[PDB]
Amino acid sequence: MREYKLVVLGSGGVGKSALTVQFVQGIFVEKYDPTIEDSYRKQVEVDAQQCMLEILDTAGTEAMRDLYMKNGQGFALVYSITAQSTFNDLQDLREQILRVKDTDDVPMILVGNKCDLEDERVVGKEQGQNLARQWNNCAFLESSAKSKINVNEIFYDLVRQINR
Amino acid sequence: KPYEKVRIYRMDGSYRSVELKHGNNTTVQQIMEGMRLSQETQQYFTIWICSENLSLQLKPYHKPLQHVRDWPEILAELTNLDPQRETPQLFLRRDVRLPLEVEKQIEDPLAILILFDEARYNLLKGFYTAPDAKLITLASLLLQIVYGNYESKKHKQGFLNEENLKSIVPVTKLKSKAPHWTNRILHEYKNLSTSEGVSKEMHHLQRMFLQNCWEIPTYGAAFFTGQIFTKNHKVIPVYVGVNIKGLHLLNMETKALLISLKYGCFMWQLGDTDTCFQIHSMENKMSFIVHTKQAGLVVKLLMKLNGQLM
Numbered sequence: 231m232r233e234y235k236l237v238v239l240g241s242g243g244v245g246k247s248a249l250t251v252q253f254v255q256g257i258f259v260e261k262y263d264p265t266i267e268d269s270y271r272k273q274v275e276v277d278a279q280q281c282m283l284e285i286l287d288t289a290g291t292e293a294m295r296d297l298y299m300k301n302g303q304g305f306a307l308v309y310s311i312t313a314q315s316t317f318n319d320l321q322d323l324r325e326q327i328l329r330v331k332d333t334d335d336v337p338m339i340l341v342g343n344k345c346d347l348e349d350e351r352v353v354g355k356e357q358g359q360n361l362a363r364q365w366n367n368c369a370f371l372e373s374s375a376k377s378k379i380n381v382n383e384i385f386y387d388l389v390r391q392i393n394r
Numbered sequence: 395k396p397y398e399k400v401r402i403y404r405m406d407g408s409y410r411s412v413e414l415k416h417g418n419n420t421t422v423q424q425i426m427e428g429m430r431l432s433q434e435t436q437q438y439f440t441i442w443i444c445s446e447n448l449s450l451q452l453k454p455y456h457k458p459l460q461h462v463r464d465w466p467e468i469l470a471e472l473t474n475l476d477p478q479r480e481t482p483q484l485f486l487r488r489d490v491r492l493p494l495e496v497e498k499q500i501e502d503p504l505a506i507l508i509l510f511d512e513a514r515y516n517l518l519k520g521f522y523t524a525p526d527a528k529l530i531t532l533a534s535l536l537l538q539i540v541y542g543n544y545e546s547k548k549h550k551q552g553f554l555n556e557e558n559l560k561s562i563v564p565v566t567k568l569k570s571k572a573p574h575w576t577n578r579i580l581h582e583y584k585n586l587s588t589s590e591g592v593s594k595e596m597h598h599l600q601r602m603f604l605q606n607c608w609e610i611p612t613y614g615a616a617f618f619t620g621q622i623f624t625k626n627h628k629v630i631p632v633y634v635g636v637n638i639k640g641l642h643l644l645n646m647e648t649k650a651l652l653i654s655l656k657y658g659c660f661m662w663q664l665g666d667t668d669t670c671f672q673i674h675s676m677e678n679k680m681s682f683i684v685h686t687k688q689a690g691l692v693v694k695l696l697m698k699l700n701g702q703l704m
């Protein structure tokens with residue numbers, strides 16, 4: 231059983247914790263408690279393999295990021311479809327990882343959260359796919375921690391990429 | 395970004411970072427606040443401090459970082475090891491005082507998974523002594539919880555190697571009675587899977603697991619180390635488990651259950667030098683002494699958990 235070090239990254243309030251806790255514990259975190267740094271462990275099966283996931287749920291604001299990126303094998307970059315700045319912020323995160331890893335080829339997924347808040351959508355699905363396309367055909371998903379849509383796939387996709 | 399923080403671990407190896415508002419002066423009580431738990435969740439659990447050779451439950455007023463600092467002195471006072479040996483970490487775990495009656499009330503999914511993770515840890519470590527059938531049930535529930543629904547295709551043959559068994563059966567049994575169990579674990583797995591009457595909600599499956607653990611005599615025990623002497627005079631190293639049900643002695647090496655005593659079926663006396671305690675097995679005409687520098691803690695806890703019944 232291979233260990234996979236996954237890192238969930240993005241600006242404050244996007245649902246990094248909510249996504250992680252839903253995935254790991256099957257619970258929806260309603261209260262907004264800014265994260266310092268939480269780590270979770272979960273055994274899953276991806277393409278017939280028992281995998282031990284270690285998921286680092288990081289702070290929206292943060293010298294640690296460099297280290298997270300050095301150590302992480304796979305990164306979920308999360309924005310809220312509800313908040314434009316959270317989407318904007320993700321360029322530097324993507325560029326920082328590439329810098330720190332010194333390679334184009336880092337397992338990575340773009341995740342637009344708060345999909346259940348369709349009404350309050352500020353960021354279009356197409357803007358989302360457009361950003362991912364441009365990022366060397368990055369994996370892309372819209373997700374909901376509340377509704378459970380595409381929660382598991384975030385982590386499974388990251389594993390697949392690492393196995394590649 | 396300056397402020398102080400600490401990792402509070404759980405049994406599964408996960409952790410939550412908690413701001414230390416008062417540096418090393420921060421208390422258990424305040425740290426428990428820094429978690430993502432309600433007044434419901436929090437009542438079941440507290441901060442422990444643990445290294446490999448010692449686990450202590452701390453109390454609301456304790457300053458955990460001070461215990462971390464003073465650990466070599468603590469190890470010196472309570473154990474026989476060289477104190478530079480090990481560094482403790484802080485963990486969130488079940489309060490040893492938590493009445494089983496109360497725990498049976500619990501509905502909160504997070505409290506259930508935290509209790510379940512800890513229970514699972516004790517099972518796999520061998521601290522839960524139970525009939526082979528009860529253990530097979532626990533392995534089957536673990537299979538449902540961790541691997542999801544039974545699949546004829548995936549699960550039928552040679553899937554329960556030692557690899558997979560290790561995650562579902564006590565380590566003490568992994569190569570003794572466990573490989574003989576596979577037919578019967580899978581059977582019960584399949585039975586769970588294809589039972590439409592048994593809920594597959596995570597918290598429901600985990601609560602079921604706990605239900606089967608509540609019956610085990612050592613459930614929820616704080617463990618201490620010490621030694622007993624038998625006939626013609628050998629040292630048997632032991633775990634002393636004190637839980638809300640009674641006192642339990644485990645052979646340290648094998649984890650075998652030596653004695654298990656319900657409260658009000660035995661008496662205890664602490665040593666004058668606070669280094670041993672005697673157990674008088676009232677209405678059983680038997681006795682034994684346990685040597686440990688933890689004797690003081692054992693006796694205090696025995697009193698508490700005994701006094702807790704009414």
Ligand SMILES: Nc1nc2c(ncn2[C@@H]2O[C@H](COP(=O)(O)OP(=O)(O)NP(=O)(O)O)[C@@H](O)[C@H]2O)c(=O)[nH]1
Pocket residue numbers: 240241242243244245246247248249259260261262263264265266288289290291343344345346347373374375376377
């Ligand atoms: N409707 C809805 N609300 C969500 C979703 N994900 C998160 N939220 C809400 O958004 C708020 C912030 O979520 P949280 O997971 O704490 O965000 P974060 O990215 O971890 N924040 P931080 O970086 O400070 O740690 C919470 O109130 C949470 O309930 C989602 O998919 N749908």
Ligand SMILES: O=Cc1c(O)ccc2ccccc12
Pocket residue numbers: 449450451452490616690691692694695698
């Ligand atoms: O004796 C004091 C204790 C206590 O009051 C509660 C829990 C404990 C757990 C482990 C070791 C000692 C204690």
Ligand SMILES: [Mg+2]
Pocket residue numbers: 246247248263264265287288289
């Ligand atoms: Mg968070």
